[PDB]
Amino acid sequence: IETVPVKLKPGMDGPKVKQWPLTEEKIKALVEICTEMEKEGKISKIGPENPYNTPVFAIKKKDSTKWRKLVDFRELNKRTQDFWLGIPHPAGLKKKKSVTVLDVGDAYFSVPLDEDFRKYTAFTIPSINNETPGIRYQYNVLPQGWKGSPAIFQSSMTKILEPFRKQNPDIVIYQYMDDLYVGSDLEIGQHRTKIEELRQHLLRWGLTGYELHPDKWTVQPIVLPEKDSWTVNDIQKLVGKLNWASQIYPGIKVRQLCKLLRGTKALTEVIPLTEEAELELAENREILKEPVHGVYYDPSKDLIAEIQKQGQGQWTYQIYQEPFKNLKTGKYARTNDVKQLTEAVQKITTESIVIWGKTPKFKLPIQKETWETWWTEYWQATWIPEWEFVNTPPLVKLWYQ
Amino acid sequence: PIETVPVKLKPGMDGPKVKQWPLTEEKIKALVEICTEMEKEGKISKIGPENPYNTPVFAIKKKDSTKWRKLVDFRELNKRTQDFWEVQLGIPHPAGLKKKKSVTVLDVGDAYFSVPLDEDFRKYTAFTIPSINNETPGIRYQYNVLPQGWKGSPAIFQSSMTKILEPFRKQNPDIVIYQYMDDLYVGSDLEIGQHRTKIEELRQHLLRWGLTTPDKKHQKEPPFLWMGYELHPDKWTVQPIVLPEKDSWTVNDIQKLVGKLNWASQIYPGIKVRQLCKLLRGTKALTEVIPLTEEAELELAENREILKEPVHGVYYDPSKDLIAEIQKQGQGQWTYQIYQEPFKNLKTGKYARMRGAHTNDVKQLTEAVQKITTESIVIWGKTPKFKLPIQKETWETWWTEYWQATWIPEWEFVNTPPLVKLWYQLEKEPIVGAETFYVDAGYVTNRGRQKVVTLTDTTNQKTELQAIYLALQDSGLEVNIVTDSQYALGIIQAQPDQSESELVNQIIEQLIKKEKVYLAWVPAH
Numbered sequence: 001i002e003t004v005p006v007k008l009k010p011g012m013d014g015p016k017v018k019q020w021p022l023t024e025e026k027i028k029a030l031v032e033i034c035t036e037m038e039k040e041g042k043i044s045k046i047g048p049e050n051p052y053n054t055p056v057f058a059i060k061k062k063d064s065t066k067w068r069k070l071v072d073f074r075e076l077n078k079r080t081q082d083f084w085l086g087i088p089h090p091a092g093l094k095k096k097k098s099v100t101v102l103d104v105g106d107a108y109f110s111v112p113l114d115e116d117f118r119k120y121t122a123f124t125i126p127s128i129n130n131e132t133p134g135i136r137y138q139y140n141v142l143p144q145g146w147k148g149s150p151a152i153f154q155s156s157m158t159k160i161l162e163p164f165r166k167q168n169p170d171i172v173i174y175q176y177m178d179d180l181y182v183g184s185d186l187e188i189g190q191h192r193t194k195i196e197e198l199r200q201h202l203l204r205w206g207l208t209g210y211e212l213h214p215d216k217w218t219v220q221p222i223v224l225p226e227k228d229s230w231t232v233n234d235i236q237k238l239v240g241k242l243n244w245a246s247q248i249y250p251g252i253k254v255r256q257l258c259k260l261l262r263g264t265k266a267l268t269e270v271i272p273l274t275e276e277a278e279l280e281l282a283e284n285r286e287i288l289k290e291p292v293h294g295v296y297y298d299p300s301k302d303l304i305a306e307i308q309k310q311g312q313g314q315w316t317y318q319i320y321q322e323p324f325k326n327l328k329t330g331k332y333a334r335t336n337d338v339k340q341l342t343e344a345v346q347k348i349t350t351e352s353i354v355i356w357g358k359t360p361k362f363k364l365p366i367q368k369e370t371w372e373t374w375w376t377e378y379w380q381a382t383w384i385p386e387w388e389f390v391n392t393p394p395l396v397k398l399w400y401q
Numbered sequence: 402p403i404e405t406v407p408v409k410l411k412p413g414m415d416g417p418k419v420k421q422w423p424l425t426e427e428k429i430k431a432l433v434e435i436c437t438e439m440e441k442e443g444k445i446s447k448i449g450p451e452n453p454y455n456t457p458v459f460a461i462k463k464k465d466s467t468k469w470r471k472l473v474d475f476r477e478l479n480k481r482t483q484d485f486w487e488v489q490l491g492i493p494h495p496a497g498l499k500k501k502k503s504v505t506v507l508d509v510g511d512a513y514f515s516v517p518l519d520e521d522f523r524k525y526t527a528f529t530i531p532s533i534n535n536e537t538p539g540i541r542y543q544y545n546v547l548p549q550g551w552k553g554s555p556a557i558f559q560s561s562m563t564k565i566l567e568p569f570r571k572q573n574p575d576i577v578i579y580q581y582m583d584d585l586y587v588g589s590d591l592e593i594g595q596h597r598t599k600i601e602e603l604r605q606h607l608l609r610w611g612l613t614t615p616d617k618k619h620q621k622e623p624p625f626l627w628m629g630y631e632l633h634p635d636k637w638t639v640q641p642i643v644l645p646e647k648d649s650w651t652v653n654d655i656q657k658l659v660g661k662l663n664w665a666s667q668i669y670p671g672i673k674v675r676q677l678c679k680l681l682r683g684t685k686a687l688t689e690v691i692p693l694t695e696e697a698e699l700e701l702a703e704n705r706e707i708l709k710e711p712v713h714g715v716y717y718d719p720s721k722d723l724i725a726e727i728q729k730q731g732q733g734q735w736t737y738q739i740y741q742e743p744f745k746n747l748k749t750g751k752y753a754r755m756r757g758a759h760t761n762d763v764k765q766l767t768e769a770v771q772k773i774t775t776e777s778i779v780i781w782g783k784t785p786k787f788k789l790p791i792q793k794e795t796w797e798t799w800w801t802e803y804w805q806a807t808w809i810p811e812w813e814f815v816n817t818p819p820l821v822k823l824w825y826q827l828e829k830e831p832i833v834g835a836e837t838f839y840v841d842a843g844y845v846t847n848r849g850r851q852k853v854v855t856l857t858d859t860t861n862q863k864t865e866l867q868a869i870y871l872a873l874q875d876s877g878l879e880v881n882i883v884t885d886s887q888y889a890l891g892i893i894q895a896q897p898d899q900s901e902s903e904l905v906n907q908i909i910e911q912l913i914k915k916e917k918v919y920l921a922w923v924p925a926h
């Protein structure tokens with residue numbers, strides 16, 4: 001076919017990323033997958049003259065006993081030229097009742113890849129204990145997980161998708177990387193059928209799970225304890241939480257509440273609130289009943305997501321672009337800690353895609369080595385967000401949930 | 402013939418154009434005999450004056466031998482040559498090998514010289530043999546095979562050996578071949594006579610592509626000393642390390658001793674360096690002499706005993722389980738051993754990495770498990786089953802309440818003192834009718850008690866900790882402490898049982914003595 005030329009951003013070179021070690025199970029899986037991709041000519045063995053590298057992994061498909069090859073193209077994506085218009089995010093997708101996510105990844109394999117770009121896709125199947133050199137390949141076709149694949153495949157897709165799009169415009173269709181998000185308001189029964197039809201209506205042309213309900217996603221507000229009696233200790237945690245929150249909502253006063261705190265009282269002394277302290281609390285509570293006014297999403301900025309381990313299988317997360325100016329807050333409840341964390345990451349990432357059409361940069365409360373070891377045991381998404389590792393302050397956890 | 406690998410020079414770069422140093426009629430004579438032997442062998446070919454590139458050549462003799470050798474200095478060609486995929490930059494750990502009945506090392510001769518070089522790249526390998534008479538020759542040549550000392554040779558060679566060896570490997574699934582630079586370690590379980598015949602079939606196979614190897618009479622016999630190891634077909638160890646019987650120890654002596662001792666820990670269990678490392682404190686010169694402490698020589702003496710008894714590692718049996726076991730050796734020190742059959746160690750190790758200024762044994766034990774897990778995936782491709790001296794309840798209590806996500810794989814409690822426990826627990830809610838200490842270096846309690854103490858040389862943060870220290874000191878077995886120091890709250894709430902800070906170690910000493918302690922933070926002004 002005719003290859004559309006692709007290039008790195010001006011002056012950049014290809015990626016040279018180290019492959020994190022793999023267990024014998026994942027290696028065999030990859031050797032199996034890659035051996036047949038090679039017979040089919042999708043990938044080819046390379047020589048020592050190609051110095052590039054991208055990490056590869058094997059994840060399990062959901063309720064399928066088969067493996068999916070996952071390629072960490074994050075470094076290459078950052079270095080691929082920006083692309084060149086009929087893809088901007090539909091804001092209608094977040095209000096839809098039902099949304100189905102389909103993996104249209106294999107479609108990409110029928111379109112060849114610019115011969116000159118190919119070398120940048122190099123990867124290696126490592127061997128155990130370095131007993132053998134490691135098999136090296138590069139792609140001959142558009143790989144799954146590269147930001148260029150959907151762009152280069154844009155035209156061939158709009159075409160196979162214009163019929164359904166006008167023969168059923170009650171449906172919204174969005175594509176992000178390897179997925180197709182199909183949205184509708186229909187009954188969850190009407191929906192699954194219309195979804196199956198699109199399946200064959202893509203099979204017609206050669207193309208081959210996840211079900212969301214965005215209409216039911218809501219913000220997790222900052223809350224205040226409501227209680228029968230208030231001890232000195234309660235009031236203290238109250239003033240501390242309120243003070244933090246006042247930086248987001250300046251209408252929060254603590255003057256009367258602080259006033260009940262004067263004196264060096266026993267921590268357990270019950271303190272009947274005055275009339276002023278009571279009204280003050282009331283207003284504060286009123287103020288926090290909704291998201292601070294003003295915050296808006298700036299498409300030119302990064303989406304940042306932070307997670308906190310609360311306890312008993314619960315986590316809290318906020319998504320912002322600027323500190324204190326949260327776009328969304330939420331909660332996630334249940335296994336082991338790592339598994340929970342990966343599922344919360346995937347969930348928060350899907351949400352961002354569905355609402356803003358972008359993936360967030362995560363700040364994860366876990367040590368790198370632990371994370372790097374286990375995330376693939378539980379990962380199921382076909383994309384990989386960027387992430388960094390942090391040390392959660394004990395005060396912030398408190399201020400959430 | 403072996404297929405050619407395409408090579409290029411770094412972008413926007415030309416070949417090297419460097420002057421051949423003035424030789425000596427004598428050295429010119431030699432280079433001319435060498436280059437002549439070589440052009441008849443096809444290794445090199447005279448070129449035209451069409452080619453403008455030049456690389457310096459010279460001649461040396463064999464170390465402790467009377468014979469001429471040709472050296473070519475490729476620093477410039479190399480600076481300009483493209484990067485290649487790393488040569489084998491990670492090597493096998495003995496513990497991950499499987500035992501063999503027989504292992505043979507085949508030394509490859511003229512390895513590089515048997516491999517062709519990219520036709521369009523040959524031009525950059527030009528060099529010049531100078532003439533003896535003024536307006537006479539000045540012989541020019543370029544390489545046709547891979548040159549010694551050139552950037553891409555190890556990589557291109559490894560890559561090619563891998564393609565040549567592939568067919569043999571398919572027909573001979575019985576044989577295991579490891580390629581390490583110039584050597585080929587070949588192991589099998591064939592009856593010894595069958596083995597010898599296969600080795601000969603390998604030699605034949607390699608000769609078809611011009612690769613020469615040593616005959617049975619001249620092959621090295623195990624044990625093989627490789628990368629600091631001593632390998633047998635059936636067992637492995639570090640090559641014997643011997644401890645000096647000096648009476649005078651230099652700072653430098655000790656660092657060498659510690660290094661060696663460290664290497665030994667991978668199979669010798671029980672090695673200790675804590676006291677020998679303490680000798681290094683405040684040292685002013687690599688040549689300063691430090692006298693040994695009663696403690697440093699007990700340790701040295703103990704190590705010297707452990708090392709007398711040679712202990713070997715056993716090789717991996719893939720049909721069996723890996724078990725990893727861990728023990729607390731001392732404050733902040735853990736030792737582990739990984740085996741398949743009891744006391745038949747595949748490998749041992751120590752862990753002392755302190756990740757942060759304050760920790761507890763639970764945290765540290767957990768980081769020990771992580772390290773071993775990563776090491777295991779690398780050497781054997783799977784995680785072992787751990788046996789730990791901690792009960793699930795202690796583990797769960799800490800994990801469940803720590804702010805970081807954590808995980809420990811499949812584990813069985815093993816009752817091997819010392820067992821890890823949490824030394825104290827902070828109350829989750831305030832204690833009723835327990836005195837309330839308000840700190841800010843001094844305190845004031847609800848009972849009218851107080852002390853504004855004096856500290857000199859104290860840092861901002863360290864003044865905060867001190868105050869808490871005071872409250873803990875002058876209070877009873879049940880206390881409520883209110884502080885505005887988010888820093889203190891952070892340290893203490895992590896519940897450390899060991900610290901770099903002496904003050905922290907004191908606070909810890911107090912927390913262990915108390916019955917119930919409750920810490921609360923309140924904003925500043």
Ligand SMILES: Cc1ccnc2c1NC(=O)c1cccnc1N2C1CC1
Pocket residue numbers: 493498499500501504577578579586587588589625627632633634635
């Ligand atoms: C250094 C080295 C590296 C990798 N493998 C091996 C060796 N050398 C051996 O001597 C060795 C020892 C025991 C079993 N296999 C061994 N071999 C295997 C190849 C037969």
Ligand SMILES: [Mg+2]
Pocket residue numbers: 839840841883884885
């Ligand atoms: Mg105070």
